[PDB]
Design an enzyme around this catalytic site. Sequence first.
Site: not given
Ligand SMILES: [Ca+2]
Length: 752
Positions: A587, A491, A289-290, A651, A122-123, A284, A230
Amino acid sequence: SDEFDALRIKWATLLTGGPALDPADSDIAARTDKLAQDANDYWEDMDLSSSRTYIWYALRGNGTSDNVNAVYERLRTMALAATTVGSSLYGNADLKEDILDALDWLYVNSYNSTRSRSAYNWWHWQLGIPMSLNDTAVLLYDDISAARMATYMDTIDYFTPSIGLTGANRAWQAIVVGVRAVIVKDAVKLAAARNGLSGTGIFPYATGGDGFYADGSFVQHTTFAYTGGYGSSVLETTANLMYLLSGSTWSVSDPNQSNVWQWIYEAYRPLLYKGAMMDMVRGREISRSYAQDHAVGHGIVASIVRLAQFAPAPHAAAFKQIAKRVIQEDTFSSFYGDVSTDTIRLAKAIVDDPSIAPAAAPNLYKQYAAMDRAVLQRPGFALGLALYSTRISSYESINSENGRGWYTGAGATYLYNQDLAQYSEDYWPTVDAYRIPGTTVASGTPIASGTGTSSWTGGVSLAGQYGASGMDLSYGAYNLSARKSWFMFDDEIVALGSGISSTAGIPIETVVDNRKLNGAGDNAWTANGAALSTGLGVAQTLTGVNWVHLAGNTADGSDIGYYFPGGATLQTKREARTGTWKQINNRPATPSTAVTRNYETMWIDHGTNPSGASYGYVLLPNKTSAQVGAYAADPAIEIVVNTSGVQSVKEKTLGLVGANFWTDTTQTADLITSNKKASVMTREIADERLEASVSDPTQANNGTIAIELARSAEGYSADPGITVTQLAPTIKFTVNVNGAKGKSFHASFQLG
Ligand SMILES: [Ca+2]
């Protein structure tokens, strides 16, 4: 005249670039030649036969919505080639005539009130085709008769007479009705389009379902992270529509329109890296590709520029600064190369404006709690983390698109550095979809599309500077469970895994990385200081390695180091892989042309039916083999705990300790003790200050999380929702996470 006419012209220049267009402009010219070329390339191939059964042989089938929609865009392209100044077909009346002949031809032969507003997709019927139709109407308005222009607008009003859907779809209805409203000069419909923007999925934040969230996430189809897919559309159409109505008696008034500004700052900015829009938030569409990441990014930045045309002063300048920085950073694909000519004109005016300075680059850690994603942005690189849970599905695949997206958001890590093409250049149709970096899976076997069974997926952010994320893994398609965590520091990024168990009877593996190499596949790499062979088609096992270094595809800024605390055995292979886009996007309009890319793939083999297996590695972006070696000798990292119950890393140089508690039992990791499932991070400035951030990643605790830090304090300050009950001998407090929805709570204590 009248406003309706002024608006129509504003929309025409938005499509054309108006009379101002300077063909002398190098980039404007290129866009123009390409238009004229493609255009007539069609025109001089149309079936102009008085008694044609189709308009284009390759697009025959008045019943296939996919083909019909495609012929309308075809026309659209020709309508623009006849309207955009500088075009080899500007003014060509015969072109215009042929366009119109083709239009009515479809009114009786296909697109008309004879069909149902339900026909497959329907889109195409309610949005796609009428979006192209409106633009043609607008561009050829003059050259159209009264009755002809009726068979056009009457049928459109049929398929989509009102606005009342969700996010992306709602906005499409809005611009579909709005645009046809101005050309048919109708204030009622036009006012209905302006008001649609206030509907769910657009202006107002959503606390469930589709739309934008206050934390900056974007959801579509109820359970998929879709800011780059979207979301991208909602941004474009809304910007275009708000720009048209801007300054007219139909201008948008809704106070919520302010949220649109935040979308840019919170929802998009953090997800853009030097032109690319992170694939982990594109759904998705990664199979198109485009629409690879940079092309998509350009479309978004294009919308930012559009916004800068009418947004309030504070924001408009900010929009210009950001657009400028992105347009300059993207040395992979020229921004002007794939956007509308009007966009080129407008951006060019920002980029050459010496009074506009590029905006600073984002340096932060953001936890998109509502869509199970996380991002880290540093000067030289960025990390995108894609997770899933009972709230967000593994991946989406409908209409035969993205058939290999199985592990795209299952603890997948995406590294962005100077190699801006990593995820472009046909990465997706050639990368081994069974080995997505960062993930743990059963070898060569897929999982299903859908939400998981565990609620524990999310993380904590320490003042948007540092963070930690976690995902309680348990696939449905086959037995396998594991506890996976990631700690992002300045880092390096530490990835931990524990509780890896399975009865599937299939070798389980954790893929450290799967990088696309240069065209030759000769990227240099070393392990423990030894240069390794660089040949293609070779598979080798590295045993007892402490660190590996892989050189990037760029001279500087794309090397990657890997450190393995306890040392490890890696399974690796450098191979040339071939595939087509049609394989992951079946497609009719998708290229079947085979493509070959090179990869260096490395994974940890956990064996078959493992129980309580674990893993630990650190990603060191942009370091030389020598820096990686130095690091591996005296590391800034120290694994506190890597168990089924708690994963924690420290850390030493920054004074950071992160910890993810997987159970609702009392556990302690270093100075931290928690009685409930949680994600916690602390920063300590010796004898001066102690900072802490906590969140309930499950978003299911309707009580509190009792925390206790092993330190003595003499004062404190905390976000609301945090109650401190003890400052000495040890710090104790609780966090009311009832309805916190994954947010992080902060508190800072003073020591002495
Ligand atoms: Ca570090």
